Structure formats: structure tokens, C-alpha cells
Amino acid sequence: AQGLATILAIGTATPPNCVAQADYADYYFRVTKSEHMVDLKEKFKRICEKTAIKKRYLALTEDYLQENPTMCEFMAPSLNARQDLVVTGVPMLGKEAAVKAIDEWGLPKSKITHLIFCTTAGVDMPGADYQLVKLLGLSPSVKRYMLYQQGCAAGGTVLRLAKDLAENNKGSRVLIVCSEITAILFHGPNENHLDSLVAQALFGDGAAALIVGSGPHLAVERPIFEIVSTDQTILPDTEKAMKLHLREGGLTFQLHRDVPLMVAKNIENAAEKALSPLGITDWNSVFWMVHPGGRAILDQVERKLNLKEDKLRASRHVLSEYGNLISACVLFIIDEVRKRSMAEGKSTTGEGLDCGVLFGFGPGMTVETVVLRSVR
């Protein structure tokens, strides 16, 4: 195609089940039948406090756990129950976000030439990509990219892949869907093996959908951000950061307690590598979209880049309103800065600034760094 890959529409959706973080420990310990673990509950009460999460939407409900109680047992086999939920739920949630993007875009869905489906919740053959084309009625000849088991940096993964798709294929229009349902990693509290206990407080459900294309038809298409550049790098010596295994008992979860420090040690290098080519040295002259793996990661990034204390508001905002949405989370944040900037009357779609940097963090530890150019 001709011109930079451009984001032209963003839609989001969540499961209807809302849970206030302020009530989560009571529910969670009630529901897993673990109220005798009071010290455990207190700790968990405290972790929920420090998440800086106000609420989450969860496809997993209390009825489901009743019917599939082994999901609450720590090492009881429960994958089949989890698959039953997410193999269906993930593409349905994704279709919901996609309808909104397609509607915002406004053009006929027959013009969608490429589908990128991304999730960290379950797998199946045929894929969630197949079900989405069916659900949506996309062309049977749409080219698909089925991204399974992707994790927390994959919101940047889908833009990096979309960029090359859109730019190498003249007139191509790419639909991106990241759809995450955290039922895959639900686990009861375990004194021993506390590992997945912070996961219970952290992750929320949702899907984000994007339309991306080169050479927008400016009469009927409305550019939101240009994708300037994408980088992916493995942080040295951080393999221990995060590990998640798909086992009989579900999606396992180990999170190293110094992950934020691993981000603090490497994040200026990623910033410099991305902005230096553009001639930018002042981090505060650009807008930031940071995957909120946790509050501490946001604070470290803010510290190490010496950000003004309002710089990560949009990121802190979707952590607050939704929790960690894994691969869909930075796409929610893109929507958030673009909507807030229109609401506030900014001169551009990127908080009135011309350039921005999105970060995704995942296993590896992997950093994805995408440079976005605002519009107007």
C-alpha cells in the first residue's frame, strides 16, 4: 500500500458481569469456600487494595464455579471446564468488540481483507479466528493470523503485525481483535504456592477491535493514529519474570516480584531507541500508552522516564476501570487517550501532542515499543 499503516476505528466490549475490587476478596474467598484462611484473606484484601483497580468485568460467574468446582481445587484437573467457557466466549466477546469497530469504520465488512485474532485464553481447531469470520460474516477468503497464548505484550504484537500487513497490501484493510477471558487462570487461594494469588486480583476480561489501513480514504475514513514504528526486544536476564504453563488444572501463573525493577532497568533504552530516530529527547513532549501489568510497573516507568504526574492518566484509567486486560489492555488505552482528547478539545488525537509511545510487557521478559503519530 501507500502511506503508514493507520488506525481508523476502535471498538471495545466486556462481559456484562461487573465486580467491584472493593468486594472481590469477600466474594473470591466466599466462592472458593476458603473463608477459614483468614490470614490468607487479609493478605489478599491487601493485594486488592494496592492494585489501583476499581472494578473488573468477568465472563466467569459464580454459577459456573458451582457447576465446575474443580476449578476451585488447586491441583484438580479443570482445563476442560475452562476450555468449554473460553473456546466459545473468547470469539463471542471478540465479535462484540468487532461490530463496534466495523460500525465506527462505517465501510462494508467485505472490504476487510485481513483478520488478526489474538488471545491468551484457550485454544481450539478450527481457531477463534474461524469462529469470528463465521460470527461476523467476513469473506471466506479473508487472510487470517491466529495468535494464541500471546500474553501481556501482544497488544503491541497485533499493531506490529498489522502495520506490515496493511503497508505491503495496497487497499488492504486489517481487522485486529484481541479478546481475553481470564477464566483460564482462575485458581482458589493456596497458602503454599501463593503464586497465582496476585493473578486473582489483577486480571479482567475484555476485547478491543481495530480497523487498520494504509492510504485512508479521507472523505469517509477517519484516521485516529498512524503507526510509525514497532520494536520487540527481550530484556537481558529476565526469563524468571513471568511464566505461565497450560496444564490439566488450567493456565498456571508465576510472576517475579521484581518485574517492575526489570522494567525500570530497561525502559529508557526502549524509549531512546524509538524516539531518538525521530529526533525526540524530551519524554514529556510525547504521549504515553503503557500496559498496566500492575500499578508498580506504571510508577516505575513514570519514575524512570521522569514523566509529569498526569502523563499516565489514560493508562491508570483503564487499569482502574477494567483491571489488566492482558493483550487487549493497551488497545483500550489507545481508545481512552483518543476519546479523552476529543472530549477535552485537544488539537490532536494524542492529548494535543504529535507523537506517542505504547509499551506492552510480556513473558521473556518481552517489551514491545510502538511509536504512534497523532492526527490533526
Place this chain on the structure above:
Amino acid sequence: AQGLATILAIGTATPPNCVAQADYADYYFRVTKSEHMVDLKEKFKRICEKTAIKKRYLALTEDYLQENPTMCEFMAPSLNARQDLVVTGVPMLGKEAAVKAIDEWGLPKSKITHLIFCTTAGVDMPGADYQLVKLLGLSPSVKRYMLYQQGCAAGGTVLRLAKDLAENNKGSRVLIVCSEITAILFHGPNENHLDSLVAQALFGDGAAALIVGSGPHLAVERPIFEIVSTDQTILPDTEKAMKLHLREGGLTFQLHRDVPLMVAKNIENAAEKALSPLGITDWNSVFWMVHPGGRAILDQVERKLNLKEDKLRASRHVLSEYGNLISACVLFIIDEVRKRSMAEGKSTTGEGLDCGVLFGFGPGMTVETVVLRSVRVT
């Protein structure tokens, strides 16, 4: 980038443990202690016979089996055991193939800018892609595409994706690794579960690796094929063709008997969509690499496009020497074709022919159609 994405090297690897198909029914029913199922044992021998497969390489060993006996159960929880095998084995097998590709390539590892890792066997976080760059010492900043649970058509998927990365990124060099270990799909024999049983006779293990790039440095790099065009379409009313679920008992397998006919029904359209823009109508005027989903799919494609009788010899060869290698299978066949061609002294890398078509067939049912342009041998 430059002109067309171009395949510049290819390497293949397999587990060292080989099994003669002729002996597989005996091996199989004896390790699963399913000896009393003489009838079904007879049934399975007939299936092994008709596969047109002579041997398969398998990472799954009988002592791993007798060590993790639930894998043998005709359904019991065994995913942990299978994962334990494949989470390590898939990237190690893939590393083995990538070293060979990079060795053929001859350029520094450091020049590899993108990695596509593709498999159908197991998943892990960090992925097989991470493991691979660590095994090979690839650049930490290599751009990765981790293709999990992909299936029998993904040999075309990786080519289709490699094509756009290589063509949109000036001077980029893409490493493609497809590595498959059929242990996720191993199951003991059981009465009315026959598609699963047919799979115990069909799939073999292996990894293929390719170096893909645009604007080859013609001094040091040697083009093998150019990737001309790429299509993916789902075949109408064939959702039931194949279904595989990853569950506590491992990966399920369900295959409809009419899959060969479903391909037959749709294949000439695929060929026509791919070759008409090139002004080609003569199917015998081109080379064909057909994913040996089974011998019957090869027969059917051959019959439907009315190819001469040894048109599919290369696809038949690797099915015979390796079994169905899921996503890497057609990449083995690309190597077979170019290696047999250079050896017979063909004037091109594509059986002496100029253009060729490769077909991947997967769940959907999906067909991936990629057009390859051969290169002249001297």
C-alpha cells in the same frame, strides 16, 4: 523492501527414533497393551497399510509411555505429560532444523530480523519462539510471530506471513520454523473412536526451517523459489471436515471420511484463482506441492486436476519417508522438489518448470494456496 519474498535456504530435522509403518500396528497395540483388541488391531493394520507411509520419526518413546501410562489410556488426564515432552521438544527439534538452514544460508545469525515459529504441539509462556532465539543465540530484538495450534495448512500460512514481512521491511531476513511433535495427539485404541485411531497411523514428527528475504544479495545468497502470490479461503459447508480440541486427555482428533472429496470439490477453483492471473491454464505445465493430509487427498487432487501420474511424486515421497508432518510437511516437500531437481539436472529448481503451486489443507476446512516461482539452475 525489494522484489518478491524469496526462499534462500531450507533445513529439515526429525527425531532420531524411526518406526517402520509395517510394524506400527504391532508396536502400537503392544505398547498400549491393547492386544486383546484383535479385531480393532486388524482394522488398524488395514489403515496403516493404506497410508502410503513407510516410516515415521517419533519423539515419543515407549519408555516415556510406560512412564506416563495415562497417555496410553483411551482417555484419561495426560496433558501435563504431553506438555512435558513437547514444550521442550518442539523448539529443540526446530533448533536442529534452523541450524541447517542457517548453515546453508551462510550469513551471520545476527542478520535474522524476524522469526516465525509455527507448531500444533503444545503451548507455553514464554513461547517456543522465545526458546528458539535462546537456543540459537538470535538477536534479543528479533521480531517474533508465535503461531500456536496452527494445523495442517500452516505450511502455507508461514509462507504467506513471511512474504509480507520480508517485502515490507527493507533488507529484513525472516527465519521460518515449523516444528511438530505428534505426542500431543497420541492415544490408545478405543471402539467407536476411529478418527482418533486413524491419526495414530497418520502423523510423523519433524521440523523445517527457511530463510526468506527480498532483494537477495546475489554474491552470497542463493534464491531457491520466489513467493509470487498467496491465498487463504475457507471451503463452504466443510466445518466438520476436521476438529481438534486440546483437553485434559491431550489433543483430540476428528476427521470426516469425505475430506478427500471436499478437497476434490474445491481444488480446481483454488488452482484457477492462483494461476489465471499468470495466464496459465495448463495444470501439467506447472509443479505441484500438495500437503499429504492423506494418500486419498493426493489421489483426488491428482485425479481432479488430471495431472500426469508422477506429478505428485515429491509430495508422495515425503509422505512415504516421513508421514504427515502437519505444518512442516509441505516445507519438506519444497526441499524435496528443489533437491530432486538439482540432482536430476533440471534447468529449474521446480522440476524444470517455471511456476508451481503449493496447497495447505487445515481445519475450516481451510485451503492455503501459494504460488512459487522456480529459479534457473545455471
